[PDB]
Amino acid sequence: GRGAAAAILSLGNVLNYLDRYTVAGVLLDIQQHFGVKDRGAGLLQSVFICSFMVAAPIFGYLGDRFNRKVILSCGIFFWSAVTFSSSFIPQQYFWLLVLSRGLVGIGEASYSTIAPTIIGDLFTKNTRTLMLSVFYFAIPLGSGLGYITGSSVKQAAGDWHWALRVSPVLGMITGTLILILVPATSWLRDMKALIRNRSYVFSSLATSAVSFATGALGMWIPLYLHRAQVVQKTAAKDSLIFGAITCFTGFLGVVTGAGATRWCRLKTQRADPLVCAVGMLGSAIFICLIFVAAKSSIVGAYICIFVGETLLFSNWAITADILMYVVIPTRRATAVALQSFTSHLLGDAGSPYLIGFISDLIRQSTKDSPLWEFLSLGYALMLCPFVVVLGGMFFLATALFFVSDRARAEQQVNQLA
């Protein structure tokens, strides 16, 4: 009565992350079918993340007042049905695809908010962590499976349409099994404190920078590689390679960071922000070489992106430790939620659209040729290393005030207790 619940919720989260990136792996086709440009090409992901951002806290609230199995089943059926129906739109409408992405966002946010509470409450203190970790290992695997599934099905059938109709039916299955196996189970005063905690603010802004980089690159890079292979007169394995890389890199970073922490925690007490800052600057150094390696040899570009992906995801498992190191316990429920909201408001909400806008504004004042389309996208994407470097300085800035923050925190907890 527990293992079945764990397995079914895990597969649910894998489907959740598999049905976000099926747009990207077929992006090149949509732009031609509907007669839109890049400025409209980024709007899909921008609207998706905006809907998710506005949705998640409301279902977080309602999850404590009505039953939760019902909400999970309703949400999974909702986004399955909407994503199945969206694939039948004709060539003269685009706002319908935009609205489709919004609704899929609502459903996905529902599931992602309410699953962890159940998978945590059905276990005790000592074993909660292992199954929570197994639950969270669904992120990179589904992320890669997105590109792989989209490219494989689109190539196999011969039309991009069925790229959005193979996934939902599998969801249609799960929507019933959760109704079979899993058993039923003053914030304002906090704000005036959290914005006076320097490490908290700087860590939040740094995570925002990381989110900007991740969203922009993850949406756009495959199209850039396609344009590169075209201009060099060498040319869709492109979407597959990338996927594979992700499915590995997310693990390595999450290991290496952790390891490098347990050493530096024994030589000083500023370990975590220093490790994160060093890794981030290294990531910037290697990322800024893709845009020069792609014009000579493609394998060099792939090696560069591999090292960048490894070093960029290192700080995934450290920011939580900082947050619980510098905040009193009875605020953590607040201090977490806010951060996630902010992490989306300055990050993936407006990144792909901004990249597309810059690219189109560059191209409108030059001749229309494959070469200049290449140069437009390549010059536009140069902002990612800039923001990575800025985030690195933000981690140094929090490494300065770390100790004083901890001292204040201990004084507060003892005074209250």
Partner: nanobody, 126 residues
């Protein structure tokens, strides 16, 4: 790991001092210090904990006014001093290291500590 030293047999009304040290060049100034005890027929209860920066200490209720815990990270040591022992204190003492904050009602959580020692015994005769 850590190394604990001291321990032995005392008469009622005496005093005894134990030490807990980090071998080698390791520092343990992040957060690493608390003392626990276990007896031959009861579960493991916490005795005391001391914090990182400000020298804030917290004790258990049955041992207030009799124990003192002190830290010294110039030589990488922590010390425990006991006065006015009774036949009830015969037990084995442990040194432990974790991340949570020194506060009341956090002594008894011995499932989140990162580093454990091996412990030394104290016996009180009559």
């Amino acid at each position: 790991q850590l190394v604990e030293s001291g321990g032995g047999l005392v008469q009622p009304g005496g005093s005894l001092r134990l030490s807990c040290a980090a071998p080698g060049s390791r520092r343990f100034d992040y957060y690493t210090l608390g003392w626990f005890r276990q007896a031959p027929g009861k579960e493991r209860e916490g005795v005391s904990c001391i914090s990182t920066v400000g020298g804030i200490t917290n004790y258990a209720d049955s041992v207030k006014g009799r124990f003192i815990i002190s830290r010294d990270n110039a030589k990488s040591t922590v010390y425990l001093q006991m006065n006015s022992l009774e036949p009830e204190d015969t037990a084995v003492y442990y040194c432990a290291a974790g991340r949570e904050m020194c506060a009341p009602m956090m002594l008894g959580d011995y499932y989140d500590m990162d580093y454990w020692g091996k412990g030394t015994p104290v016996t009180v005769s009559s």
